Write a protein that binds this ligand. Structure first.
Ligand SMILES: Nc1nc2c(ncn2[C@@H]2O[C@H](COP(=O)(O)OP(=O)(O)OP(=O)(O)O)[C@@H](O)[C@H]2O)c(=O)[nH]1
Ligand SMILES: CN[C@@H]1CCc2c(ccc(O)c2O)[C@H]1O
Lengths: 331, 278, 230, 52
């Protein structure tokens, strides 16, 4: 009855996007000259964390950044001069994410206590605690100075109102735990990747799902938009990175090699979007060519697996965090 | 004998510099335990760089051409290097004993500042028994051969009273020996006690390693340094009994021990991968 | 500009002084993870002795236990966080063999936890709860273990066993249940981590000394293996 | 939840799609246009590098 139309509807979508694919992305970009060999060297090394690092976020000024560690601290650094600015002790030692407000006046936090905490940096004390999730938080991003979107392990995402501490809207439709999210440049749409090897596109204003992408075969760990805003890249623990297109409603290219079998922890783009930086469980990082799917460089120097990655808004440096309680700046 | 002596110098120098540069270059090998290894490697490197070449030149040429002050300086640095190298093994043994016997308080007891204080105390005690009694002429013997040797400029063989030959020998060798024996016996007893428990609990579902490790560690050190520190007392207690050739041979056998420490104390997999990287 | 750098450096030194003070506390405390298979009297043995946390001290040593109750998922993704704990405490009701079964599910969960890719150097302290009513229902003839575990028919009580005036039947059942876990423990263990099973009841009052001794053994064995003596 | 899945499937089934040949060209054009100001792509002199 009802399930009968699901098989017909699913096949209709598959055949609808099968005719659209007239040429692959790699076929068009055969005549582009290769980017060549890219070599980067460590410029800074930040020390002071007593345990492994799980999260990191750059500042809008491209000068200050924040990090989180399992020992129960939330340290704000000064990358130019390598001087600690703040150190916020956490009530709960298990922290999985952190965020930095665009205006630079607030910092978010969350983890295994199912609570999101917002701290006031220009007064440091807890400003608000958001409750209502029934699972551990995985990611959080600041829409504005008064609203924030979060994802958790109860297969739902929510949009909060910081002033009142109430959920404005809730996004449902996933089956597995939601692992990451990323906001669009215009802050009107966002994507999320969950453990059922699926990624969906949501509408913030209307609170409805738009499209679904199911090109993976394992739990998705990271996601990030293209700088243009019409594409995004994901990374799962099957040693593959894939590029998806919003307008074509299908994937365009995959990034994998036969000499790597570990998982992928984080992905990030560059200022122009030609380079794709992905962190791995092989204790190092890899640099890809977005339009060619070939390696261009290797970032090595971490003693344990890399868990965090970020690129400044102005694109001068790359910051990587790992489980050896160290942070490095690459340029 | 030049080929054999040259190879000994190269082996000691090459081995210790590799260990030193591996700890400094890599941040994953910087541990409180590794500071003692660094101090021991520095002592062995200084020994191999300074003592061995000049002794080899003296043996081969059969004359001393560097004067009378440099011979005293060479003897003083010899005693300083020998004393400071044996006393670090005692510190390593005590550290392992504290780590194994008292596991809960080991992290609190040992700190980097305490390790630095211990290392400088060891080096100060080593320097207070070599340069001070030798440069102040408190160790010189009193007979015709010794006084003629002291007067002569090209002959500066080793002659010593009974008091110095007893005190320096005791401080350099005998106090560390009993401490090492006691702590290693207790460590072996703990290892056997913990090995019996696994057999008692889950034995049917399935002490050579500890015996081999402790045997190697104690045997190399004892077989390297015991005969010399026995004949050192013997040749003073009883006169005209120990020939100079035997004394020099046993001293050089003791010197050889400086090239074996990197093998014994740096066989960890982290050290192996560090050496592979370099 | 010149005064700004000096003022900024003043705050860094003050922060670094506090970090050193807090590092002594972090390294002197032991973290424990408490896992339960469901039912099994997990809360009873905790009260007598989001995420819930508790702290206790014995013989001037600080222990800090963790219990997760806000994440009720068949697949555990948060298990990666607890890869640096001293030990894991597993609580199972040994008397739930007939009830629909629970013992096989607990064994499967133990097998999944033991062979995890991230918990490859962590030992497990096993508590076999609810012994008195297990003995009562074994004495009662209304139930038989062989009707649910066919391997029990060809099992004999070990000669190297320590019965508590105890019926040989309940002793045989107890050792069979314990050996079911011990087989999985020894199947894949390579010396990096062991298992410490205990028989626990409701009236027990020494469940904390057992944890203390097991943690001491874990640390001592780790050091012995590190120094190539084991 | 049988009706909810079909209703959501029908909502996202009727959308306008463009060929891959246009999306790839758009991405290529954006990259070619903005590759000039990409500090990670081409090294910058140490005079204007704040991290050196
Ligand atoms: N005889 C005996 N009964 C127990 C024991 N532990 C719990 N019970 C019984 O269990 C009842 C309470 O429920 P629990 O088994 O403690 O359930 P719980 O501790 O909340 O375990 P979870 O629900 O999994 O968190 C008590 O009334 C006891 O009769 C035990 O060790 N021995
Ligand atoms: C000439 N060689 C010296 C002679 C005596 C001596 C040595 C080393 C340590 C000591 O405590 C000593 O008394 C030898 O290295």
């Amino acid at each position: 009855q009802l399930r009968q139309e699901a098989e017909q509807l699913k096949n209709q979508i598959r055949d609808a996007r099968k005719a659209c694919a007239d040429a692959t992305l790699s076929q068009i970009t055969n005549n582009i000259d290769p980017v060549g060999r890219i070599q980067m060297r460590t410029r800074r090394t930040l020390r002071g964390h007593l345990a492994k690092i799980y999260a990191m976020h750059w500042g809008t000024d491209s000068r200050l950044l924040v990090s989180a560690s399992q020992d129960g601290k939330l340290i704000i650094w000064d990358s130019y001069t390598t001087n600690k600015v703040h150190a916020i002790p956490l009530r709960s030692s298990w922290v999985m994410t952190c965020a930095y407000a665009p205006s630079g006046n607030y910092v978010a936090c969350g983890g295994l206590d199912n609570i999101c905490s917002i701290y006031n940096l220009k007064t440091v004390r807890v400003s608000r605690e958001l409750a209502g999730h029934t699972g551990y938080l995985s990611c959080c991003r600041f829409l504005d100075d008064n609203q924030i979107v979060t994802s958790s392990g109860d297969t739902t995402c929510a949009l909060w109102d910081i002033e009142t501490g109430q959920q404005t809207t809730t996004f449902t439709g996933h089956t597995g735990d939601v692992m990451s999210l990323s906001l669009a440049p215009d802050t009107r749409l966002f994507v999320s990747g969950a453990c059922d090897a699926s990624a969906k596109l949501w509408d913030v204003r209307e609170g409805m799902c738009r499209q679904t992408f199911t090109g993976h075969e394992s739990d998705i760990n990271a996601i990030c938009f293209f700088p243009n805003g019409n594409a995004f890249a994901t990374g799962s623990d099957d040693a593959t990175c894939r590029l998806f297109d919003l307008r074509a409603d299908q994937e365009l290219m995959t990034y994998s090699h036969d000499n790597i079998i570990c998982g992928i922890t984080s992905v990030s783009f560059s200022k122009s979007g030609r380079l794709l930086l992905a962190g791995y469980d092989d204790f190092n990082c890899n640099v890809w060519d977005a339009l060619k799917a070939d390696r261009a460089g290797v970032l090595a120097g971490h003693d344990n697996r890399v868990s965090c990655l970020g690129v400044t808004d102005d694109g001068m440096a790359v910051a990587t965090g790992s489980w050896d309680s160290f942070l490095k700046i690459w340029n | 004998m030049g080929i054999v002596m040259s190879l000994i110098v190269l082996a000691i120098v090459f081995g210790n510099v590799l260990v030193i540069t591996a700890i400094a270059k890599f941040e994953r090998l910087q541990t409180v335990t590794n500071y003692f290894i660094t101090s021991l490697a520095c002592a062995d490197l200084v020994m191999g760089l300074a003592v061995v070449p000049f002794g080899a030149a003296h043996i081969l040429t059969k004359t001393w051409t560097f004067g009378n002050f440099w011979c005293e300086f060479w003897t003083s640095i010899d005693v300083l290097c020998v004393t400071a190298s044996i006393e670090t093994l005692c510190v390593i043994a005590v550290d392992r004993y504290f780590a194994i016997t008292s596991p809960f308080k080991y992290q609190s007891l040992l700190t980097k500042n305490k390790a630095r204080v211990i290392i400088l105390m060891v080096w100060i005690v080593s320097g207070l028994t070599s340069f001070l009694p030798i440069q102040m002429h408190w160790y010189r013997a009193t007979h015709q051969e010794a006084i003629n040797c002291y007067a002569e400029e090209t002959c500066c063989d080793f002659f010593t009273n009974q008091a110095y030959a007893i005190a320096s020998s005791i401080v350099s060798f005998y106090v560390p020996l009993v401490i090492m024996v006691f702590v290693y016996s207790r460590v072996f007893q703990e290892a056997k006690r913990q090995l019996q428990k696994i057999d008692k609990s889950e034995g049917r579902f399935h002490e050579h390693k500890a015996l081999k490790t402790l045997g190697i560690i104690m045997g190399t050190f004892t077989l390297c340094w015991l005969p010399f520190f026995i004949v050192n007392i013997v040749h003073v207690i009883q006169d005209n009994l120990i020939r100079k050739e035997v004394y020099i041979l046993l001293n050089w056998i003791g010197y050889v021990n400086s090239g074996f420490n990197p093998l014994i104390y740096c066989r960890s997999p982290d050290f192996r991968i560090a050496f592979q990287e370099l | 500009q010149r005064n700004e750098e000096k003022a900024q450096r003043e705050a860094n030194k003050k922060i670094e002084k506090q970090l050193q003070k807090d590092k002594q506390v972090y390294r002197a405390t032991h973290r424990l993870l408490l896992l339960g298979a469901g039912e099994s009297g997990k809360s009873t043995i905790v009260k007598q002795m989001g995420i819930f946390e508790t702290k206790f001290q014995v013989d001037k040593v600080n222990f800090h236990m963790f219990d997760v109750g806000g994440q009720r998922d068949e697949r555990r993704k948060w298990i990666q966080c607890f890869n640096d704990v001293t030990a894991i405490i597993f609580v199972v009701a040994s008397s739930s063999y007939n009830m629909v079964n629970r013992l096989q599910e607990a064994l499967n969960l133990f097998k999944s936890i033991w062979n995890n890719r991230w918990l490859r150097t962590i030992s497990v302290i096993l508590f076999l709860n609810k012994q008195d009513l297990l003995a009562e229902k074994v004495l009662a003839g209304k139930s038989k273990i062989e009707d649910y575990f066919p391997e029990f028919a060809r099992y004999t009580t070990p000669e190297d066993a320590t019965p508590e005036g105890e019926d040989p039947r309940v002793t045989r059942a107890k050792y069979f249940i314990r050996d079911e876990f011990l087989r999985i423990s020894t199947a894949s263990g390579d010396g990096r981590h062991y298992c410490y099973p205990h028989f626990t009841c409701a009236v027990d009052t020494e469940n904390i000394r057992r944890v203390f001794n097991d943690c001491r053994d874990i640390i001592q064995r780790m050091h012995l293996r590190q120094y190539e003596l084991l | 939840q049988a009706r909810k899945l079909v209703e959501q499937l029908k909502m996202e089934a009727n959308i306008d799609r463009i060929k891959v040949s246009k999306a790839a060209a758009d991405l290529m054009a954006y990259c070619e246009a903005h590759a000039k100001e990409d500090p990670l792509l081409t090294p910058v002199p140490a005079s204007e590098n704040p991290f050196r």
